[PDB]
C-alpha cells in the first residue's frame, strides 16, 4: 500500500492504525472491507452528489475549484454510481436531479436481451411513433425493460422443482446460443443432404460410410435443440409479452373502462380475449399491481353497481374482503394435502396459451419444431430450416418485409395482370386460334388455344414469362390475311403485360426494399445526429469538443432515465425529495410533462 503509488506515508500509517492484531499478527481484509467500506461508500456518494450539484450549478470559483479537485478525486470512484436527469416541472425551468445507480441495474442493462429490446424500441418508436406518443412509448418501454431486468436477475417437492427451475433458467439463459447451434446443425444437415444421389430408391451414394448414421444423429440432435429453443423461449420472452398484455388490459380497465363503459367492438379479437380473463383469479400475475381490481371497483362501483362490478371482475361475495383483511386477518395457510395439482386456474392458463400462440415468434419456433418433426419423417424437410438465416440477418429480414410491405398494391397489380392476360386470352381464343400449334413434326396438332381454360393458362404461363411477349414462341403469320391484326395484338401484349405491368410489380417490390432500407438509415442518422428526449439538434451542441456526445451520454441518457424510474419505483416513498416526489406524482397520474420537450440545461442557463 506504500509502493502502489496511491498512498502517502501518512495515509499508510493512518490505515495501519485501523488494524485488529488478533494475537498472531494477521488482519482479515475480508471483514475489514465488509465492515469499513459500505457506510463510507454511502456517505461518500451523498457528499459526491452534493459536490457535483454545486459544481454543475456554480462554476468558476477558485475556492470551489480546490473543493472540486478534491471532489473529483472522490468522484473517480462514484462516476458509474451517480446518474443525472433533466426534469422540467414545478418550476417552469430545467432542473438537474441526481440519483443512485445500482451495479445490479447496470449488469441487467448490459444483459443481451435488454439491448435487443432497446434497439427494437428505438426502431419502432422512430419509424411509426411520432412525437405525441413518443414519451408514452418511452415510459412503457422503461417499464417493460425494468420488468425484463428483474426477470434476468431472477434467471419430494423440494427435489424435482428446484432442479426443473434450474433447467428452465439455464435454457432461458442460453436461448440465443441454442439458436446459433440449431442454425449450425441445420447447415450441416443440409450439406449432408446435398451430398446425395438416387438409384424410386433414395440412397446417399456420393460418400463411402461415415455419412449415413451421422445424418440421423444430426436430425435427432436438431430436433432436441429445437425443443430446447422453444422451451427456453417460453421461459425467457413469454413473461415479457404476457406482462405487456396484462399491463395494457389493466390500464384499459382502470383508466378507460374498456369492459365497464366502452365495451370493445366485434372484430377486435384482442378485446374479447382480454375480456376472457378480466375476471380471473390471478389477473395481474406479472404487472406487480395486485390492486387494479380494487382500484377499478372503487372507481366504477358507485355508478354501475358494486355487485355488478364484483361479479364481472371476479372475486365474488368478497366486497368486504378488504375490511376483513384490515381487521383481524389470517396469518397464513398451508397449501394442501389432497390437492397437489389443479391448483392453477385453467382459465388463466388457457389465456396464456392463447396469447403465446399469437406472438408471431412463438409461432415461428412452433413452425420450426414441426418442420424438424416432419424432417424426421422425410429428411428433405430439413431444407426449410435454411430460411432461418433470413430471419437472423438484418437485410434479409428487410427483403422479406419488403416483399410483404406493399401487400395490397402487389395483390391488386397481380389481379390487373391476370385480367389483361384474360382479355388477351379471349381475343386470341376468338380470332387468333389457328396460330397456337405447339409442335415440330406432329402429325397430331397440339393446339393450346382450342379450349378457353387451356388457352388462358397457356397465356398466363408462356406469354408473361417469355420476356418478349407471346408471339416470339408461336408461329409467325407471314400472310396478308391477319398479319396486321396479329402483330398489333402481339405488340400491345408485349407492351402492357411485359414492359409495363410486370415492370410495375418489379418496381413495387424494389421500391419497398429501398424504402425499408432508407427508413433504417434515417433512423440510424436520427439517433446519431439528434437527441431522443429533447431533440434540440446537433449543431447546437457542436460548439465544444465532444459536445453532443457528452450531452447524449451524460445529460439525456435513456439508460439514466430508466435507472431514475427504477430508483423512484424502489425508493420507498415518504423518503422522496421534492423533485422525486413531483416526478413520481406525474408518473402516477400519467402526464409525462416532466420530460424536457423543447429545452435543456444548456439552453436554459449559461
Residues of this chain, 441-480, that bind a second copy according to CB under 8 A: 446, 448, 450-453, 456-457, 460-462, 464-469, 471-473, 476, 478
Torsions phi, psi for 446 (to 5 deg): -95, 70
The listed partner (a second copy, Zn ion, none) that binds 461, CB under 5 to 8 Å by sort, is: a second copy
Task: List binders of Zn ion among 540-559 (CB under 5 A).
Answer: 556
User: Does residue 220 contact residue 208 with C-beta atoms inside 8 Å?
Assistant: no
CA distances from 68 to 50, 97, 284 (A): 11, 19, 49
How far apart (Å, rounded) are the C-alpha atoms in residues 527 and 535?
10
Torsions phi, psi for 596 (to 5 deg): -70, 105
The listed partner (a second copy, Zn ion, none) that binds 531, CB under 5 to 8 Å by sort, is: Zn ion
Look up residue 447 and give its DSSP letter.
Answer: B
Beta-bridge partners for 309: none
User: Does residue 148 contact residue 240 with C-beta atoms inside 8 Å?
Assistant: yes
Site string for a second copy, 357-386 (x = CB under 8 A): -----------------------x--x--x
The listed partner (a second copy, Zn ion, none) that binds 556, CB under 5 to 8 Å by sort, is: Zn ion
Asked whether position 194 contacts a second copy by CB under 8 A, the answer is: yes
Closer to a second copy by Cβ: residue 185 or 249: 185
DSSP-derived pairing of the beta strands 82-88 and 94-100: antiparallel
Task: List binders of Zn ion among 446-505 (CB under 5 A).
Answer: none
DSSP-derived pairing of the beta strands 197-198 and 82-88: unpaired
Query: Where does this chain touch a second copy (CB under 8 A) — which range of 196-204, 259-267, 299-307, 335-343?
Result: 196-204
Close Cβ partners of 510 (under 8 Å, ≥ 6 residues apart):
none
Q: Give least dist CB 354 to a second copy, A.
A: 32
Look up residue 95 and give its DSSP letter.
Answer: E
How far apart (Å, rounded) are the C-alpha atoms in residues 544 and 210?
66
Closer to a second copy by Cβ: residue 88 or 501: 501
User: Does residue 219 contact residue 189 with C-beta atoms inside 8 Å?
Assistant: yes
- Total residues binding a second copy (CB under 8 A): 78
Torsions phi, psi for 301 (to 5 deg): -90, -35
Helices (H), 127-211: 134-154, 157-173, 175-194
Task: List binders of a second copy among 487-506 (CB under 8 A).
Answer: 487, 490-491, 494-495, 498-506
Closer to a second copy by Cβ: residue 27 or 389: 389
The listed partner (a second copy, Zn ion, none) that binds 504, CB under 5 to 8 Å by sort, is: a second copy
Of the candidates 89, 35, 31, 80, the residue with the CA atom closest to the CA atom of residue 592 = 89
Closer to a second copy by Cβ: residue 387 or 568: 387
Phi-psi bin for 280: left (phi > 0), alpha (psi -120 to 50), beta?
A: beta
Site string for Zn ion, 508-547 (x = CB under 5 A): -----------------------x--x-------------
Task: Dig out the grid coordinates for 164 from the structure.
Answer: 426443473
Closer to a second copy by Cβ: residue 511 or 599: 511
Asked whether position 391 contacts a second copy by CB under 8 A, the answer is: no
Q: For the chain, how far is it from start to end, CA to CA, in angstroms? A: 43
Q: Give least dist CB 98 to a second copy, A.
A: 28
Asked whether position 545 contacts a second copy by CB under 8 A, the answer is: yes
- Total residues binding Zn ion (CB under 5 A): 3
**Which of 203, 220, 390, 391 touches a second copy by CB under 8 A?**
390
The listed partner (a second copy, Zn ion, none) that binds 423, CB under 5 to 8 Å by sort, is: a second copy
Residues lying near Zn ion in the complex (CB under 5 A): 531, 534, 556
Amino acid at each position: 500500500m506504500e509502493s502502489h503509488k496511491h498512498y502517502t506515508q501518512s495515509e499508510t500509517e493512518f490505515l495501519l492504525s485501523c488494524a485488529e492484531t488478533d494475537e498472531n499478527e494477521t488482519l482479515d481484509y475480508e471483514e475489514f472491507v465488509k465492515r469499513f467500506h459500505e457506510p463510507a461508500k454511502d456517505i461518500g456518494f451523498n457528499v459526491a452528489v452534493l459536490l457535483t450539484n454545486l459544481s454543475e450549478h456554480m462554476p468558476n470559483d477558485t475556492r470551489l475549484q480546490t473543493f472540486l479537485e478534491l471532489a473529483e478525486s472522490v468522484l473517480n470512484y462514484f462516476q458509474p454510481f451517480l446518474g443525472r436527469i433533466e426534469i422540467m416541472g414545478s418550476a417552469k425551468r430545467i432542473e438537474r436531479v441526481y440519483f443512485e445507480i445500482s451495479e445490479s441495474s447496470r449488469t441487467q442493462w448490459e444483459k443481451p436481451q435488454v439491448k435487443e429490446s432497446k434497439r427494437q424500441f428505438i426502431f419502432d418508436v422512430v419509424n411509426e411513433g411520432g412525437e405525441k406518443e413518443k414519451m408514452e412509448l418511452f415510459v412503457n418501454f422503461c417499464e417493460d425493460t425494468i420488468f425484463e431486468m428483474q426477470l434476468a436477475a431472477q434467471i419430494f417437492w423440494k427435489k424435482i422443482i428446484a432442479y426443473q427451475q434450474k433447467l428452465l433458467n439455464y435454457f432461458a439463459r442460453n436461448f440465443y446460443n441454442m439458436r446459433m447451434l440449431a442454425l449450425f446443425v441445420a447447415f450441416a444437415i443440409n450439406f449432408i443432404l446435398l451430398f446425395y444421389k438416387v438409384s424410386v430408391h433414395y440412397v446417399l451414394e456420393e460418400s463411402s460410410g461415415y455419412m449415413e448414421p451421422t445424418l440421423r444423429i444430426l436430425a435427432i440432435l436438431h430436433t432436441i435443440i429445437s425443443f430446447f429453443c422453444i422451451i427456453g423461449y417460453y421461459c425467457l420472452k413469454v413473461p415479457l409479452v404476457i406482462f405487456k398484455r396484462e399491463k395494457e388490459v389493466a390500464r384499459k380497465l382502470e383508466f378507460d373502462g374498456l369492459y365497464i363503459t366502452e365495451q370493445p367492438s366485434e372484430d377486435d379479437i384482442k378485446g374479447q380475449w382480454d375480456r376472457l380473463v378480466i375476471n380471473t383469479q390471478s389477473f395481474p400475475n406479472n404487472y406487480w399491481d395486485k390492486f387494479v381490481k380494487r382500484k377499478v371497483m372503487d372507481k366504477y362501483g358507485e355508478f354501475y353497481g358494486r355487485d355488478r362490478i364484483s361479479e364481472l371482475l371476479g372475486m365474488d361475495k368478497a366486497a368486504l374482503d378488504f375490511s376483513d383483511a384490515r381487521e383481524k386477518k389470517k396469518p397464513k395457510k398451508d397449501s394442501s394435502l389432497s390437492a397437489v395439482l389443479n391448483s392453477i386456474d385453467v382459465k388463466y392458463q388457457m389465456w396464456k396459451l392463447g396469447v403465446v400462440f399469437t406472438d408471431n415468434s412463438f409461432l415461428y419456433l412452433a413452425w420450426y419444431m414441426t418442420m424438424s418433426v416432419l424432417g424426421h419423417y422425410n429428411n428433405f424437410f430439413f431444407a426449410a430450416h435454411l430460411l432461418d438465416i433470413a430471419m437472423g440477418f438484418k437485410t434479409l429480414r428487410t427483403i422479406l418485409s419488403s416483399v410483404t410491405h406493399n401487400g395490397k398494391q402487389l395483390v391488386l397489380t397481380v389481379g390487373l395482370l391476370a385480367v389483361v392476360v384474360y382479355l388477351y386470352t379471349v381475343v386470341a381464343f376468338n380470332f387468333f386460334r389457328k396460330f397456337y400449334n405447339k409442335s415440330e413434326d406432329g402429325d397430331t396438332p397440339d393446339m393450346k388455344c382450342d379450349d378457353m381454360l387451356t388457352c388462358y393458362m397457356f397465356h398466363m404461363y408462356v406469354g408473361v414469362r417469355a420476356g418478349g411477349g407471346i408471339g416470339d414462341e408461336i408461329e409467325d403469320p407471314a400472310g396478308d390475311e391477319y398479319e396486321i391484326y396479329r402483330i398489333i395484338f402481339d405488340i400491345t401484349f408485349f407492351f402492357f403485360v411485359i414492359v409495363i405491368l410486370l415492370a410495375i410489380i418489379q418496381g413495387l417490390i424494389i421500391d419497398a426494399f429501398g424504402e425499408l432500407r432508407d427508413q433504417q438509415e434515417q433512423v440510424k442518422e436520427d439517433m446519431e445526429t439528434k437527441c431522443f428526449i429533447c431533440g434540440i439538434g446537433n449543431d447546437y451542441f457542436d460548439t465544444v469538443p465532444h459536445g453532443f456526445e457528452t450531452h447524449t451520454l451524460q445529460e439525456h441518457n435513456l439508460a439514466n432515465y430508466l435507472f431514475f424510474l427504477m430508483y423512484l419505483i424502489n425508493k420507498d416513498e415518504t423518503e422522496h425529495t421534492g423533485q422525486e416526489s413531483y416526478v413520481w406524482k406525474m408518473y402516477q397520474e400519467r402526464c409525462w410533462e416532466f420530460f424536457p420537450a423543447g429545452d435543456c440545461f444548456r439552453k436554459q442557463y449559461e
